[PDB]
Structure 1
Amino acid sequence: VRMNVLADALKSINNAEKRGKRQVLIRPCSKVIVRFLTVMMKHGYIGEFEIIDDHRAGKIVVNLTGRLNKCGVISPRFDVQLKDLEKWQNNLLPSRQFGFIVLTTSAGIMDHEEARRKHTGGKILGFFF
């Protein structure tokens, strides 16, 4: 009965990019999803997006370009320790030249190439490549 809201959002965006659409509607939404989509946008994998108020959980409309290839969620938010980070980005990512692991840390929601920069691990959310 909708235990994981980020899982639906990323599966919904993903089932529609393969089809070839140009815009997708996501419902419900959250601070977490909005932060995740921002990480996916600062890097250029999606276009700008618009959030709809409705006095409940809201909805999001996202503008897709074709650059996206996959995005997904790791269902239990496991802990990762910056010495076990390589064993993750070597299992989940397709090549060491692109793709990103997204994880939540005391310093916000970020991507592993920045967690290494600020010297902190945390809990894994997903990936996109």
Structure 2
Amino acid sequence: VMTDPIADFLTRIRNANMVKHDKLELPASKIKKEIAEILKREGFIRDVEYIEDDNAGTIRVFLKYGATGERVITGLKRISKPGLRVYAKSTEVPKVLNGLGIAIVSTSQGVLTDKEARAKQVGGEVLAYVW
């Protein structure tokens, strides 16, 4: 059965990148909103829209490629799996690809990236690595 809806978000984007698909849509959730919204802030995804329906709504994401078809996202990874959750202190927040990537952290002040977390001295659950 479905045991990790966040992992599906991470892997659906990865599966669409390989075949250069220009868009995708998937069932919506509150936590997926920030993750999808965060990616738009650093240009990892070209756009995002919400569709309201009966069950839970629907979200579609517009993937982004450079001129002459280079991927903008070269990898997505899930860290804190349901089988082994991980937590990071204020000084333990990593730097994905030596600052050229980002990490999504679910702090007590909201879901925000690794760079912003070290500016507020808070920790939380590390959710994903995007580079």
Contact kept in structure 1, 2:105 and 2:124, CA below 8 Å: yes
1:93-104 equivalences under 5 Å are 93=96, 95-104=97-106
TM-score of the two chains, using structure 2 as the length reference = 0.86
1:120 corresponds to which residue? 122
1:31 maps to: 30
Q: Distance in 1 between matches of 2:99 and 2:124?
A: 23
Q: Which runs of 5+ in 1 are unaligned?
A: none
Instruction: Name the counterpart of 2:14.
Output: 14
Q: Equivalent residue for 2:91?
A: 83
Q: Distance in 2 between matches of 1:97 and 1:116?
A: 13
1:67-112 deviation line (CA, Å, top 9, x unaligned): 11112222143110023224xx3xxx3x314001111011110111
5+ long unaligned stretches in structure 2: 66-71
TM-score (norm 1): 0.87
Distance in 2 of aligned mates of 1:77 and 1:54: 32
Structure 1: distance between partners of 2:114 and 2:99: 13
SS for the counterpart of 1:110 is strand
Question: What residue is the counterpart of 1:68 in the other structure?
Answer: 73
The amino acid of 1:46's aligned partner reads I
Q: How many residues are matched?
A: 122
Determine if the alignment matches structure 1 residue 4 to structure 2 residue 4.
yes
Shift of 1:13: 1.1
SS of residue matched to 1:77: coil
Task: Give CA-to-partner distance per residue, 1:33-52, whole Å, 9 cap, x none.
Answer: 11001111100010111111
1:103, 1:109 within 8 Å by CA — same for their partners in 2?
A: yes
What SS class does the counterpart of residue 84 from structure 1 fall into?
A: coil
Identity among equivalent pairs (%): 27
Q: 1:39 to 1:77 in 2, by over 3 A?
A: farther
2:36 corresponds to which letter in structure 1? L
- Please list every run of at least 4 consecutive aligned residues from structure 1 whose deviation after the TM superposition is greater than 6 angstroms: none
Residues in 2 aligned to 1:50 and 1:102: alpha-carbon distance in whole angstroms: 20
